[PDB]
Amino acid sequence: PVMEELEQGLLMQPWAWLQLAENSLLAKVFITKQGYALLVSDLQQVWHEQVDTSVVSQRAKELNKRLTAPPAAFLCHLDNLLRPLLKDAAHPSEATFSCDCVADALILRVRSELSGLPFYWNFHCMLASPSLVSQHLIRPLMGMSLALQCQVRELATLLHMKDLEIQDYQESGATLIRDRLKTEPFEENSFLEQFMIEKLPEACSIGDGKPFVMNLQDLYMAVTTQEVQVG
Amino acid sequence: VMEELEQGLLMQPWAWLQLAENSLLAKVFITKQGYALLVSDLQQVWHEQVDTSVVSQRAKELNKRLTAPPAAFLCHLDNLLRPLLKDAAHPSEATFSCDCVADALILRVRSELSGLPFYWNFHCMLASPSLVSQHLIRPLMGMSLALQCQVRELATLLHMKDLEIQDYQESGATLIRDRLKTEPFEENSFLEQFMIEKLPEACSIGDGKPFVMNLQDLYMAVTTQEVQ
């Protein structure tokens, strides 16, 4: 049950932006007293790591070599360090992050000052399985796109209703107090064509993933919750 | 050659394939120099790239007597497959089947040309993470961003229309029909209500048919922009 709980918690968690040394990553970490589950990406490859208590203790002793703490305390400290950075950027949490690409694995090194005290951790994230990356990125993104298309359709029909109201008002025999407020009739085809011609290049620019985690997280979380509830 | 095939595959839309009580999303690009195929089931993605030598050898192995040049075989395969992918429910005899190997997928297509059998097999191996990413993740994120921008623009237009309606009302001239009254538009309330009721049905990915039927043009535009 511990593994299932960790997987569910990771799935429910939203994406966050990590500013490594001269690089950027999209990270999604769920940490509980029994271990943690991390999923990192850079829009080109996705690495995953599910880690339990025994390996946590082994790695902590190997790295720190002088810190004697139980796995639960280590997990709690790691979660406390990581949460402020994921929640918001530019947080002076004193968490230096480094990335190493050796073989197909990824070494994510985190250094912190635990009350002015070195604290080192290393995520050995192997390549994510096709099923995990699929259910975490592809299906949720398709659901988000479908939901946004439905929202666009609802807005278009509401705009058509408002246009009909404006036409009825004009037919009633009334004139606007001003003239700048006049709005030309809304056409779905013309609006879509103009958008595609003009604003599509700017909107489509994902860049380093910051827009995705800035404007497409509430919808992503809702879609993921719906998917997990369904099955 | 290889670059041309990769670009063609990247610049093509997903098509729905129905076969043996199963559904797939397929992107196929054929050319005289070979073909590229990408098949997904929303759980795994398989990619295949075949050149003239491989296509000729496989055609000889399968069709024991279809003595044709590789270019002609590829052209016939394209002419037989593209009509189905472009539009579903086509009057063709292209029967499809899948065999799920431990790691590979055998996609067998059997059809009839001029009333004679025509067999072909795609031995699609699991697509590399880079290919799957570039083909699905980044374009999907671009589509989401574009749709969000469209929603924002529509909300701005709705706000302008609300301002116009308010200005009309302040003049004191009421409507002739009272059934056309629409309440003022509010982004927060509309978004909350939509998420409450229509989100479960809107976000129902299903077997992939709605994705192909709804927003393939946006996917193509996003992919073309990404290529440039």
From Swiss-Prot, chain B:
The modification Phosphoserine is found at residues 133, 204. Changing residue 204 to D: In XLF-Asp mutant; phospho-mimetic mutant; abolished ability to bridge DNA. Residues 129-171 form a coiled coil. Keywords: Chromosomal rearrangement, Chromosome, Coiled coil, Disease variant, DNA damage, DNA repair, DNA-binding, Nucleus, Phosphoprotein, SCID. Changing residue 140 to A: Does not affect ability to participate in V(D)J recombination. The record marks 116 as: Leu-lock. GO terms for biological process: B cell differentiation; central nervous system development; double-strand break repair via nonhomologous end joining; immunoglobulin V(D)J recombination; positive regulation of ligase activity; response to ionizing radiation; T cell differentiation; telomere maintenance. Changing residue 118 to A: Does not affect ability to participate in V(D)J recombination. One of its GO terms (molecular function) is DNA polymerase binding. Changing residue 16 to A: Does not affect ability to participate in V(D)J recombination. It is found in: Nucleus; Chromosome. Residues 2-136 are annotated as: Globular head. Changing residue 65 to G: Does not affect ability to participate in V(D)J recombination. Changing residue 183 to A: Does not affect ability to participate in V(D)J recombination. The keyword Phosphoprotein applies. Changing residue 170 to A: Does not affect ability to repair double-strand breaks (DSBs). Does not affect interaction with XRCC4. Changing residue 62 to E: Does not affect ability to participate in V(D)J recombination. Phosphorylated by PRKDC at the C-terminus in response to DNA damage. Phosphorylations by PRKDC at the C-terminus of XRCC4 and NHEJ1/XLF are highly redundant and regulate ability of the XRCC4-NHEJ1/XLF subcomplex to bridge DNA. Phosphorylation does not prevent interaction with XRCC4 but disrupts ability to bridge DNA and promotes detachment from DNA. Changing residue 180 to A: Impaired ability to repair double-strand breaks (DSBs). Does not affect interaction with XRCC4. Changing residue 58 to G: In IMD124; likely pathogenic; fails to translocate to the nucleus; decreased ability to repair double-strand breaks (DSBs); impaired ability to participate in V(D)J recombination. Homodimer; mainly exists as a homodimer when not associated with XRCC4. Interacts with XRCC4; the interaction is direct and is mediated via a head-to-head interaction between N-terminal head regions. Component of the core long-range non-homologous end joining (NHEJ) complex (also named DNA-PK complex) composed of PRKDC, LIG4, XRCC4, XRCC6/Ku70, XRCC5/Ku86 and NHEJ1/XLF. Additional component of the NHEJ complex includes PAXX. The coiled-coil region mediates homodimerization. Belongs to the XRCC4-XLF family. XLF subfamily. It is linked to Immunodeficiency 124, severe combined: A form of severe combined immunodeficiency (SCID), a genetically and clinically heterogeneous group of rare congenital disorders characterized by impairment of both humoral and cell-mediated immunity, leukopenia and low or absent antibody levels. Patients with SCID present in infancy with recurrent, persistent infections by opportunistic organisms. The common characteristic of all types of SCID is absence of T-cell-mediated cellular immunity due to a defect in T- cell development. Microphthalmia/coloboma 13: A form of colobomatous microphthalmia, a disorder of eye formation, ranging from small size of a single eye to complete bilateral absence of ocular tissues. Ocular abnormalities like coloboma, opacities of the cornea and lens, scaring of the retina and choroid, and other abnormalities may also be present. Ocular colobomas are a set of malformations resulting from abnormal morphogenesis of the optic cup and stalk, and the fusion of the fetal fissure (optic fissure). This is Non-homologous end-joining factor 1. The chain holds residues 1 to 227 of 299 of the full protein.
